[PDB]
């Protein structure tokens, strides 16, 4: 029931092992092990058949086969209803007492969800047959008084250690484009016309490790970037991007909000493969994807969406609702102060956030024939209650970085209050 700091799309969540149904529906058997005796229960796989459990909120789309395909994309699971993997439990009773050995079949719970704007519109639960659970305790008394006990509710209980591993997968309904040649320091990619019909992903790799600025020529639409999990250090070709069809993706940074004029600043490694999801444009004019390696401390924003702020030449509040990064992650805002430039001319601003708490860093963006450069103007250990004002030079450009420290809501609200 907590917030999920991720972009729209499909996710397979491994919710843990040791799941089993109530009322002993998965009880294999109980052994009464007398003192000075050993007992054992075995799953020998004399038959490789296993019985997965499935549940879905939408049988038409999120069918079992579909869900299984997602699970394969996420964790690369091969076998769903067979196993050659044996499990066995062995227990010796002490000399003084008798022991009770209960063994159950178990499952690993994988949750497939269709996540849209902080909401789950579709959900399926796949229970992958696991390697069992064994409970040993002092044998109960054959004479223990029988207590009429009503059956429990139909369902599952979790028996294994806590686990919640989220793995996003490429949306199978959105096509994958591919930039064959490792992109150099500068590169422009023309988005195919297919973009008018649906969003797509662009798979690529950089020729040189470093920080990169990525965006559409108009900073619109907003871009999202992912890493191809496990794509590093596999087949490689200096003059060509080797494929793995890895459909498992790690969200780096990016947003879905339609009016989030912006560009990305991310750290990219050449030994890895990345995906840039371009939303459905829906225009007859050709859009472009521009890549540019940045030298300099612009890397301070590494892995962050830089949101360009609009309508600043007014007084008071200036709210900007955006999908919140996870605790510890960044989200940036670019500000070109209204008015012409001349050192002395300035305007008073008060930076603040409203839903989630975080740590802020104010930078002065400067140009050089050696690339960009950021000068730290100030830092904020409390953004939700910041009241400290700051004067900024008119006609100058500032970037405000927010590191989330508290994820209270799906969206993080940024307020660039203008005092004057």
């Amino acid at each position: 029931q907590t917030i999920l700091p991720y972009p729209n799309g499909l996710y397979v969540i491994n919710k843990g092992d040791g799941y089993m149904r109530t009322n002993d529906k998965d009880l294999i058997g109980t052994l009464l092990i007398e003192s000075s005796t050993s007992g054992s229960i075995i799953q020998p796989r004399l038959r490789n058949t296993t019985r997965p459990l499935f549940n879905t909120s939408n049988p038409t789309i999120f069918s079992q086969e579909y869900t299984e395909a997602r699970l394969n994309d996420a964790f690369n699971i091969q076998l769903f209803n067979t196993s050659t993997t044996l499990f066995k439990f062995v227990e010796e009773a002490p000399t003084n007492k008798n022991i009770s050995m209960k063994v159950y079949n178990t499952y690993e719970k994988y949750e497939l969800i269709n996540y849209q704007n902080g909401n789950i519109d579709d959900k399926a639960e796949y229970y992958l047959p696991s390697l069992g659970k064994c409970e040993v305790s002092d044998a109960p008394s054959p004479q223990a008084p029988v207590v009429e006990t009503p059956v429990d509710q139909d369902g599952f209980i979790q028996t294994g250690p806590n686990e919640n591993i989220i793995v996003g997968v490429i949306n199978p309904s959105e096509n994958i484009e591919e930039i064959s040649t490792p992109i150099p320091d500068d590169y422009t990619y023309n988005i195919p016309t297919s973009i008018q019909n649906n969003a797509c992903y662009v798979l690529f790799k950089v020729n040189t490790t470093g920080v990169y600025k990525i965006t559409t020529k108009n900073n619109l639409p907003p871009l999202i970037i992912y890493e191809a999990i496990g794509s590093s250090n596999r087949n490689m070709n200096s003059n060509n991007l080797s494929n793995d069809n890895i459909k498992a993706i790690k969200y780096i940074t990016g947003l879905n909000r339609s009016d989030a004029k912006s560009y990305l600043i991310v750290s990219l490694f050449k030994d890895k493969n990345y995906y840039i999801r371009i939303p459905q444009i829906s225009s007859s004019t050709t859009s472009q994807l521009i890549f540019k390696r940045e030298l300099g401390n612009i890397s301070d924003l590494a892995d962050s969406t830089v949101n360009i702020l609009d309508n600043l030449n007014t007084s008071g509040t200036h709210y900007y609702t955006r999908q919140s990064p996870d605790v510890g992650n960044y989200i940036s805002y670019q500000l070109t102060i209204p008015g012409d430039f001349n050192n002395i001319a300035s305007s008073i601003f008060s930076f603040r956030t409203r839903n989630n708490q975080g740590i802020g860093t104010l930078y002065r963006l400067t140009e050089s024939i050696n690339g960009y450069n950021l000068i730290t103007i100030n830092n904020y250990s409390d953004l939700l209650n910041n009241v400290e004002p700051i004067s900024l030079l008119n006609g100058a450009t500032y970037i405000f970085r927010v590191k989330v420290t508290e994820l209270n809501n799906y969206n993080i609200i940024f307020d660039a209050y203008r005092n004057s």
């Binding site: 529906k25 109980t30 052994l31 009464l32 000075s36 075995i42 004399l46 296993t50 004479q143 006990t149």
Partner: protein, 170 residues
Amino acid sequence: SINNVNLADGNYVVNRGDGWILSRQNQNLGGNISNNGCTAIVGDLRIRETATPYYYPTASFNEEYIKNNVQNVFANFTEASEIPIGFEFSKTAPSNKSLYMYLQYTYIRYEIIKVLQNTVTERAVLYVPSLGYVKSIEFNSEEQIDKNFYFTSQDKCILNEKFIYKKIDD
């Protein structure tokens, strides 16, 4: 007696617990003999082919009625029977004596009871093959053994009996 329950009137499916051994079937599988510190091991594989359920239906509750109502609330034994499961027991014979251990199957006792005035009017019974249980005893050609060691005259549970119910509908 065993017919006095504290339940509203109606028909119920009850899980009497695992660990039930059946009347006089004690030595049907045979016994094992070892001595002088040797370790003895006996085991089995309740393969569907062998392990078959024991039904004791009544007028109001036929076999089918019992099966479906048990497999609906509790473990579906018909499906599980397709997957072989094993169990073994081991024990070390004493230094200078003989050890005898015999094996028998254990079951889960399920019941379908008809209640009326907090008393069971009808009772159907089902024993679903579970695993197994071994009994040991040390000996020498001399010793006389209590015959109850070898024989169970009345079905019973080697663990604590249970009473987990659910009222049947329709």
